[PDB]
């Protein structure tokens, strides 16, 4: 029983890490696309002015 909870401690650790790296990158995705949307403002506004 203690052995099995070692394996499923490991599974837990892995899943924590997977969401950490997955959502880091998925939040970055969208975030930087939002930065592109932000780019639309600032980029065109230089010449708009």
């Amino acid at each position: 029983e203690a052995i099995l909870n070692l394996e499923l401690k490991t599974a837990g650790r892995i899943n924590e890490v997977l969401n950490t790296k997955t959502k880091d990158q998925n939040i970055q995705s969208i975030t930087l696309q939002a930065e592109i949307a932000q780019k639309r403002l600032d980029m065109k506004y230089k010449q708009m002015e």
Binding site: L6, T20, D24, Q25, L32, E35, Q38, K39, D42
Partner: protein
């Protein structure tokens, strides 16, 4: 000795984590830089 070493086997299983933190740093760099760059896009225009 086997008990002692089942314990040590786990002590050794207990660096990857520090690298995971380092990986978050790698994202921070590049994330900030792309937004830096949109700010530069306005400057560059």
């Amino acid at each position: 000795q086997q008990i002692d070493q089942q314990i040590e086997e786990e002590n050794i299983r207990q660096q990857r984590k520090a690298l995971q933190r380092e990986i978050e740093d790698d994202v921070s760099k590049q994330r900030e830089i792309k937004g830096q760059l949109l700010a530069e896009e306005f400057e560059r225009e």
